[PDB]
Amino acid sequence: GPAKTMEEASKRSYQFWDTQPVPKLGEVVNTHGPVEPDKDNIRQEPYTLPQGFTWDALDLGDRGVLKELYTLLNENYVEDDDNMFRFDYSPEFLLWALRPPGWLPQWHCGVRVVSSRKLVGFISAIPANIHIYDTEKKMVEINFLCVHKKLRSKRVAPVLIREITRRVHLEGIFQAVYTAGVVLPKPVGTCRYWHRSLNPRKLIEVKFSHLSRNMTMQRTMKLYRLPETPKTAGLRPMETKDIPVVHQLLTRYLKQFHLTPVMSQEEVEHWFYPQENIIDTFVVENANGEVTDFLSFYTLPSTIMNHPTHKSLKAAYSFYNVHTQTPLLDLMSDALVLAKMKGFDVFNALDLMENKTFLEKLKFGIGDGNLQYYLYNWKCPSMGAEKVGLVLQ
């Protein structure tokens, strides 16, 4: 069973994670470097799966295979604390997240039932250059670890982790970054989700949020009402011509944080060029024609389980927001208006980077879920949320 708190986790004994090159939960880290040296010979054979299951690298270019992955995640991926909502990553979103520049087919690591061919497990890696304190490292980002509900608590997650580690090691990469809602050895940083109601009536109806102690429904709606149009001058969707300046603005802005991505210009195009129902980016082009700011949020809806009338929650997630002339609070205020305009029910954001300067003023409510950040085979001091400058899908 998984722990949600550093104090409840420190009671626990980590059978799998004790074997891994990550620091112990209790120990304090005053060093900067790999937990273990790079390996110069790597196991050539895939790790043994339980009887009746086989490895299968998923070609997400095949529409049918992509649909299989959608279904596995739609039915077996992350749920809330109370089993009321589940992530509903779209097929198109999964392509965006899993085929960035440098993606590899063998890093789309799935598990299939031998007889039926049913997809029952998945884990993924994508390449990413990561700046951690004073070191820049080629790493991978691990994401979408999923074991079918009927396969849980059978030690299948550790063989998925070890197999993707083997396949990443084969490409000469020995560090990784990943997040989780549970506590594991050992978080480099702990971030908290905050939520901004956009359609507060639907949220309360489906029990995503709740009426505050002494507030009517009519009052909750007036509180969360937003303008129909953003206020910032020159705000417009990102275009192809904005790719270099967006890359420039992002690269300089991220320097103030201690855990950041380092994106090429092609990676900036992939992660920020707007795709409807996936990623939205708006730039601020001023009176001189100069792009000075940009905001971005990605689309991640959720399934509402066991509700006869409301089936889906449309959530927007704060991505990367860079300000150099427009105040961050004005920038994020326009993000809320834009999200409201696009039919989103809620706008989610973490307390990382400078987000705490605007969360309360813009009527975000603190969430019940922490997002722990972890590094694999890298030792470094932990950092506060405001020093985390990395957002994953």
Binding site: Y77, V78, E79, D80, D81, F85, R86, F87, N143, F144, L145, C146, Y178, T179, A180, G181, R192, Y193, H195, F208, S209, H210, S302, N348, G365, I366, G367, D368, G369, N370, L371, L392, Q393
Partner: peptide, 8 residues
Amino acid sequence: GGCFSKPK
């Protein structure tokens, strides 16, 4: 992977 949060 991620974490599904909802307001406390």
